[PDB]
Design a protein around this ligand. Structure first.
Ligand code: 3PE
Ligand code: 3PE
Ligand code: I49
Lengths: 171, 113
C-alpha cells in the first residue's frame, strides 16, 4: 500500500461471512450499496482524474542520508570543530530515537484497540517491546535537563557504567 | 614604538584601512550628523542649508578617522606581535598540553530531576 507492513504490522483480517437467521431485510446491506453508488463511485472517479494529472508530471524527492562522523567520545576536550559535528549528530539521533519510541507506542495503541476485550492477553508482545524500548530510551536520555548535550549524555552513561562495574565487583 | 610618534615607520608594513571600511563609513555618518546638528541649532533648513558646510563636516570626519583607524589597527598589530614574541621566548611558561578525549576524561553527571 503506502507504508511498510513490517514497521507497522497488522495481523491478518478474519471477517466472518454473513449468516442471516432472520427473514427481515438488513438495513445496513442496502445502506452500504447506496453508499458505494452515491459516495464511493463519484469520489473514486474524481480521484482517478487527479491521478491522471499526477502521472503526466512525475518527479521525485529523496530521504536525506547523513554520513556518520566521530562521536563526542573521540573529541579532544574544548575542540569545538569536532565537538560541533559530534553534537549535531547526537541531536539527530536523539530526535530519531524519539520517533522510534513513538512507533512502538503506536503499535501498542493499535493492538489495544484491535484486540477488544482480549487485549490484556493478545497484546503481551507489544507491551514487552514497549517496556524494553522505553527502558533503553530512559537510560540514554532521561534526567539530562533542558540544556542536554552529548557531553551530558556521556557523563550519564559513564556514571551508569561505573555502577554496573561495582555491582559486578560484588558478585 | 617610536617616541611621541603617531604612526611609527614600522606601521607601513601593514595594509591601510580600505576607504570602504565599515568603521570609516560610520565615522563619515557621524560627520553628516554633525552637519545636520549644526544647521538645527542655528535654525537653518536642516537638510538643505549650506551643503558646502555639510560636505566639509563629512570630509573632515573621514580624514581624521582614517588616520585614527590606521593607528588603531597598528596598535593591535603591535599587541599581537609582542604577545607572540614573548610566548616564543618563554616556552616553559606556555607548555603545549596533552589533550584527552571525552571518552577518557571523567565528568560528573548532575541529574535534572
Ligand atoms: C539612513 C539614515 C538613518 C537615520 C539614522 C539616525 C541615527 C541617529 C542620528 C542622530 C542625528 C540626527 C540628525 C540631527 C538632528 C537634525 C534633525 C532635526 O533636528 O530636526 C528635524 C529636521 C526637520 O526639521 P527642520 O528643522 O524644520 O528642518 C527642515 C529640513 N527639511 O530634519 C529633518 O528633516 C529630518 C532629519 C533626520 C531626523 C533625525 C531625528 C533624530 C533621531 C534621534 C533618535 C535616535 C536615533 C535612533 C537610535 C538608533 C541609532 C541607530
Ligand atoms: C574619533 C572618530 C570620529 C572622528 C572625530 C573627528 C573630529 C575632528 C574632525 C574635525 C571636526 C570639525 C569639522 C568642522 C567641519 C565644519 C567646518 C565648516 O564647514 O566651516 C565652514 C566655514 C569655514 O570654513 P573655512 O575655515 O573658511 O575653510 C577653510 C579652512 N582654511 O564657516 C562656517 O560657517 C562653519 C561654522 C560651523 C563650525 C563650528 C565651529 C568650529 C569652527 C571650525 C572652523 C573651520 C574648521 C575647518 C575643519 C578642517 C579640519 C580638517
Ligand atoms: N595594563 C597595562 N597597564 N598595560 C597594558 N596596556 N597592557 C596590555 C598590553 C597592550 C594592550 C594593547 C596594546 I594596542 C598594546 Cl601595544 C599592548
Amino acid at each position: 500500500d503506502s507504508w511498510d507492513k513490517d514497521v507497522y504490522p497488522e495481523p491478518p483480517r478474519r471477517t466472518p461471512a454473513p449468516s442471516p437467521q432472520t427473514s427481515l431485510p438488513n438495513p445496513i446491506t442496502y445502506l452500504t450499496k447506496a453508499f458505494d453508488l452515491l459516495v464511493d463511485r463519484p469520489v473514486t472517479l474524481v480521484r482517478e482524474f487527479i491521478e491522471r494529472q499526477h502521472a503526466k508530471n512525475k518527479y521525485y524527492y529523496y530521504h536525506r542520508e547523513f554520513r556518520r562522523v566521530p562521536d563526542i567520545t573521540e573529541c579532544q576536550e574544548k575542540d569545538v570543530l569536532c565537538m560541533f559535528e559530534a553534537e549535531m549528530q547526537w541531536r539527530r539521533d536523539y530526535k530519531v530515537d524519539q520517533e522510534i519510541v513513538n512507533i512502538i507506542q503506536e503499535r501498542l495503541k493499535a493492538c489495544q484497540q484491535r484486540e477488544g476485550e482480549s487485549h490484556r492477553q493478545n497484546c503481551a508482545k507489544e507491551l514487552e517491546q514497549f517496556t524494553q524500548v522505553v527502558k533503553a530510551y530512559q537510560d540514554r536520555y532521561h534526567d539530562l535537563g533542558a540544556h542536554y548535550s552529548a557531553r551530558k549524555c556521556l557523563a550519564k552513561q559513564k556514571q551508569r557504567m561505573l555502577a554496573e562495574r561495582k555491582a559486578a565487583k560484588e558478585a | 614604538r617610536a617616541t611621541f610618534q603617531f604612526l611609527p615607520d614600522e606601521a607601513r608594513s601593514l595594509p591601510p584601512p580600505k576607504l570602504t571600511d565599515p568603521r570609516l563609513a560610520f565615522v563619515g555618518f557621524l560627520g553628516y550628523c554633525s552637519g545636520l546638528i549644526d544647521n538645527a541649532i542655528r535654525r537653518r533648513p536642516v537638510l538643505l542649508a549650506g551643503l558646502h558646510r555639510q560636505l566639509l563636516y563629512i570630509t573632515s570626519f573621514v580624514f581624521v578617522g582614517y588616520y585614527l583607524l590606521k593607528r588603531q589597527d597598528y596598535m593591535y598589530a603591535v599587541r599581537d606581535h609582542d604577545m607572540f614574541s614573548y610566548i616564543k621566548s618563554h616556552p616553559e611558561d606556555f607548555p603545549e598540553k596533552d589533550k584527552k578525549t571525552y571518552g577518557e576524561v571523567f565528568e560528573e553527571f548532575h541529574p535534572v530531576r
